[PDB]
Design a protein around this motif. Structure first.
Motif, short mmCIF file in Angstrom:
data_model
loop_
_atom_site.label_atom_id
_atom_site.label_comp_id
_atom_site.label_asym_id
_atom_site.label_seq_id
_atom_site.Cartn_x
_atom_site.Cartn_y
_atom_site.Cartn_z
N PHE A 1 -9.26 -3.14 -7.80
CA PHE A 1 -8.36 -2.55 -6.81
C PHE A 1 -7.32 -3.56 -6.34
CE2 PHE A 1 -6.91 0.75 -4.29
CZ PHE A 1 -6.77 0.37 -2.98
N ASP A 2 -7.73 -4.83 -6.16
CA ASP A 2 -6.77 -5.86 -5.78
C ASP A 2 -5.63 -5.96 -6.79
OD1 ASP A 2 -8.79 -8.50 -4.22
OD2 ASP A 2 -8.00 -6.61 -3.46
N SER A 3 -5.97 -5.92 -8.08
CA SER A 3 -4.95 -6.11 -9.11
C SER A 3 -3.99 -4.92 -9.18
CB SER A 3 -5.62 -6.34 -10.47
OG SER A 3 -4.66 -6.43 -11.50
N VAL A 4 -4.49 -3.70 -8.98
CA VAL A 4 -3.58 -2.56 -9.04
C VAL A 4 -2.69 -2.52 -7.80
CG1 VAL A 4 -5.12 -0.78 -8.12
CG2 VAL A 4 -3.28 -0.17 -9.75
N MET A 5 -3.24 -2.88 -6.64
CA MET A 5 -2.43 -2.94 -5.42
C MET A 5 -1.30 -3.96 -5.55
SD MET A 5 -3.12 -0.56 -3.42
CE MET A 5 -2.24 -0.91 -1.89
N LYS A 6 -1.57 -5.11 -6.17
CA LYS A 6 -0.52 -6.11 -6.37
C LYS A 6 0.54 -5.61 -7.33
CE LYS A 6 -3.40 -10.02 -5.15
NZ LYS A 6 -4.72 -10.62 -5.53
N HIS A 7 0.13 -4.95 -8.42
CA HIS A 7 1.09 -4.46 -9.40
C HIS A 7 1.98 -3.37 -8.82
CE1 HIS A 7 2.30 -3.45 -13.65
NE2 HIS A 7 2.62 -2.34 -13.03
N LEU A 8 1.39 -2.46 -8.04
CA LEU A 8 2.18 -1.41 -7.40
C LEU A 8 3.18 -2.00 -6.41
CD1 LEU A 8 -0.68 1.15 -6.74
CD2 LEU A 8 1.15 1.40 -8.42
N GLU A 9 2.76 -3.01 -5.65
CA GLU A 9 3.68 -3.63 -4.69
C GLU A 9 4.85 -4.29 -5.39
OE1 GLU A 9 3.68 -6.34 -0.65
OE2 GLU A 9 1.82 -6.17 -1.82
N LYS A 10 4.60 -4.99 -6.50
CA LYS A 10 5.70 -5.59 -7.26
C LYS A 10 6.66 -4.53 -7.78
CE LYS A 10 6.61 -9.14 -8.18
NZ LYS A 10 7.63 -9.93 -7.43
N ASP A 11 6.16 -3.34 -8.12
CA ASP A 11 6.99 -2.22 -8.52
C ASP A 11 7.53 -1.42 -7.34
OD1 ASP A 11 7.09 -2.62 -11.22
OD2 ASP A 11 5.51 -1.18 -11.71
N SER A 12 7.45 -1.96 -6.12
CA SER A 12 8.06 -1.36 -4.95
C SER A 12 7.35 -0.07 -4.53
CB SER A 12 9.55 -1.13 -5.17
OG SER A 12 10.23 -2.37 -5.35
#
Ligand SMILES: NC(=O)C1=CN([C@@H]2O[C@H](COP(=O)(O)OP(=O)(O)OC[C@H]3O[C@@H](n4cnc5c(N)ncnc54)[C@H](OP(=O)(O)O)[C@@H]3O)[C@@H](O)[C@H]2O)C=CC1
Ligand SMILES: NC(=O)C1=CN([C@@H]2O[C@H](COP(=O)(O)OP(=O)(O)OC[C@H]3O[C@@H](n4cnc5c(N)ncnc54)[C@H](OP(=O)(O)O)[C@@H]3O)[C@@H](O)[C@H]2O)C=CC1
Ligand SMILES: CC1(C)NC(N)=NC(N)N1c1ccc(Cl)cc1
Ligand SMILES: CC1(C)NC(N)=NC(N)N1c1ccc(Cl)cc1
Ligand SMILES: CC1(C)NC(N)=NC(N)N1c1ccc(Cl)cc1
Ligand SMILES: CC1(C)NC(N)=NC(N)N1c1ccc(Cl)cc1
Lengths: 208, 201
Positions: free
Chosen positions: A100-111
């Motif tokens: 979950f941490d990794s997907v939350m970071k990826h989504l944030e980078k994609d705005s």
């Protein structure tokens, strides 16, 4: 402001749980077929502000319970969690992430956008292992719990083996109108009846 | 192997932990945190609590062994035996770890989830140098009363915390498996905060 901000999508844990045990599973699958409850699940997880889309996040075993003709769940960003995933998006638009941490970071980078649509809400849709971890994650904003009650004959009771490890004293149940405000829909109030079951749609936020 | 934690409540900044064979403060909710953390295990699993002989003797006999957990007591004078209540009386951390491993880290067919070192100062000050220790669970206690009432302590940690780094709160919760209050808690003349640390590298 700085209190209750809007800098990321709200995160809900959405589940249907048998009272009083918080039972959610039997022999690897869902122990009841409640037609209208499944309609509620689709309607809630799909309802987004104009021009937005929602995400559904699930463990690998729950993904494998979805019949292939349903995959990916329509109209929503599908995220599957498996420890060996490589944080990739496949050709069907499905996100295969390792935490979950990794997907939350990826989504944030994609705005918090998915195919040029901003995300509205993020729903965690199961299963047991994911629910038992994410109930502790401070980022979770609310619980959407369908409280399921068996009211049929003793011979027909569901035989449960999988239960939520959740401490509801850490949460507070909200008024029905708050549920409707959050999910964006008119929602049946009180007990709904189907077959041998009664059930009630509820919403909880963190206590204090 | 199971993860190994040193779990302690220590007054800041002296790292005092005891006075005359008792804790220097009476914090009911902190003691409940210790009980909840050391007892919380995956279904069908059990945790261990490892302590020095003097701390064992401070538990009232009626409450020994600490219920629901595998109790290990270290005394140089122990014969590495398991008693009728399932209590492990071992001569070193070494010997008990080698015995637990030969048993596949299982006790009565239950896998060990976590191993907690629960005091006192002699065991803490030795085992913080043991490479097998994975984390520290430190309740940081603060005296917030008047200077005339500040506590006296006779037993202290000798820990070099420059070798450790404090983790975010959600990592504490994930490890202990419980929703834990964040920040300072108040009881009487003391405030206290639950913290978790891993090796700084
Ligand atoms: N509302 C309800 O009543 C619901 C009930 N359920 C029930 O839940 C049960 C299935 O739950 P469960 O078996 O626990 O399977 P999950 O759906 O929770 O998927 C478990 C898998 O998720 C992955 N995973 C677990 N923890 C992590 C982590 N920290 N980071 C990344 N990936 C992780 C692993 O995949 P890998 O092994 O690939 O690493 C693990 O095998 C069924 O009985 C189903 O019916 C499901 C949904 C909702
Ligand atoms: N605030 C907190 O979190 C805690 C506070 N405390 C406090 O700490 C104090 C007690 O701590 P302390 O006096 O240091 O006693 P300990 O609990 O550390 O017990 C010391 C005993 O442990 C045994 N021991 C020491 N080193 C070894 C070794 N290398 N191998 C095997 N056995 C060993 C010896 O037993 P023998 O002599 O039999 O060989 C020694 O006498 C009390 O004030 C108590 O209240 C206790 C626990 C936690
Ligand atoms: C049980 C149902 C239908 N209803 C509900 N309220 N919450 C969830 N997560 N649900 C669910 C959804 C998708 C999958 Cl694959 C498995 C279970
Ligand atoms: C996809 C969903 C929620 N919607 C629907 N209309 N029918 C079914 N069977 N569904 C489902 C339910 C439970 C599990 Cl475990 C997996 C998939
Ligand atoms: C101080 C307390 C209660 N709280 C804490 N956080 N850690 C530990 N080890 N604690 C403790 C537990 C058992 C015994 Cl016999 C003595 C002290
Ligand atoms: C372990 C615990 C909390 N459990 C219990 N039931 N009684 C007592 N006195 N306990 C205790 C407290 C402090 C110290 Cl230093 C040693 C033991």
């Amino acid at each position: 402001g700085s209190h209750m901000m809007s800098t990321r999508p709200k995160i809900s844990l959405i589940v249907a749980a048998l009272q009083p045990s918080m039972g959610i599973g039997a022999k690897g699958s869902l122990p009841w077929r409640l037609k209208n409850e499944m309609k509620y699940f689709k309607d809630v997880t799909s309802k987004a502000k104009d021009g937005h889309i929602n995400a559904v996040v699930m463990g690998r075993k729950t993904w494998e319970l979805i019949p292939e003709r349903f995959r990916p769940l329509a109209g929503r960003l599908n995220v599957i969690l498996s420890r060996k995933n490589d944080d990739l998006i496949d050709s069907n638009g499905v996100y295969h992430f390792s935490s979950f941490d990794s997907v939350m970071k990826h989504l944030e980078k994609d705005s918090f956008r998915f195919k040029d649509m901003p995300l509205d809400k993020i729903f965690i849709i199961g299963g047991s292992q994911i629910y038992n971890l994410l109930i502790l994650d401070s980022r979770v904003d609310n619980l959407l719990v369908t409280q399921v009650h068996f009211v049929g004959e003793d011979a027909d009771k569901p035989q449960m083996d999988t239960f939520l490890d959740w401490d509801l004293s850490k949460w507070k149940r909200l008024e029905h109108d708050k549920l409707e405000q959050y999910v964006g829909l008119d929602v049946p109030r009180g007990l709904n009846e189907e077959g041998s079951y009664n059930y009630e749609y509820t919403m909880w936020e963190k206590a204090q």
